């Protein structure tokens, strides 16, 4: 059972250190847009909140280390940072997911590819098209077959 994974990493030349992240990417803004509805009320995707947490706990850590706080605080900060990143990638893989406003879980990146809604399930169900219409039918007996 182990040899399959070990050989998978043994092949293709690529190193296994990719499983630890020294930096994480940020999705372009318009894929997680902030839009003001009619009347001035704003609507925003959940992603730009998850990222925010990762930005917060990281910065505090970069501050906390500078002043040399005891390890009891620095290690808790590191645990928080890692938990925030984990929730950003796959919310709910840790346990009870983060919820934020209301009492609904926040959609992570993986949730945009995993469930019924996503670019791997919803994409194959077709798309709405222009130059199209719909209407009820009646029998035309005088029509030719074509």
């Amino acid at each position: 059972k182990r040899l399959k994974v070990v050989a998978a990493f043994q092949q293709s030349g690529n190193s296994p250190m990719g499983m630890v992240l020294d930096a994480v990417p940020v999705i372009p803004p318009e894929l997680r847009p902030m839009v003001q509805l009619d009347g001035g009320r704003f609507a925003t995707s959940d992603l730009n909140d998850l990222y925010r947490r990762v930005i917060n706990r990281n910065n505090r850590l970069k501050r906390l280390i500078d002043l040399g706080a005891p390890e009891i605080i620095v290690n808790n900060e590191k645990r928080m940072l890692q938990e925030s990143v984990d929730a950003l990638f796959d919310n709910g893989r840790r346990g009870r997911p983060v919820t934020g406003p209301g009492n609904r879980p926040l959609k992570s990146l993986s949730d945009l590819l995993k469930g019924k809604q996503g670019r791997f399930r919803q994409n194959l169900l077709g798309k709405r098209v222009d130059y199209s219409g719909r209407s009820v039918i009646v029998v035309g007996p005088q029509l030719k077959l074509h």
Partner: peptide, 24 residues
């Protein structure tokens, strides 16, 4: 909730008495 680890870890150090704070 998983804040219990922090509560446990900080729970291994006893509180200071009035005279220890000045010493520290």
């Amino acid at each position: 909730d998983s804040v219990r680890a922090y509560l446990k870890q900080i729970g291994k150090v006893a509180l200071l008495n009035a005279e220890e704070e000045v010493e520290l």
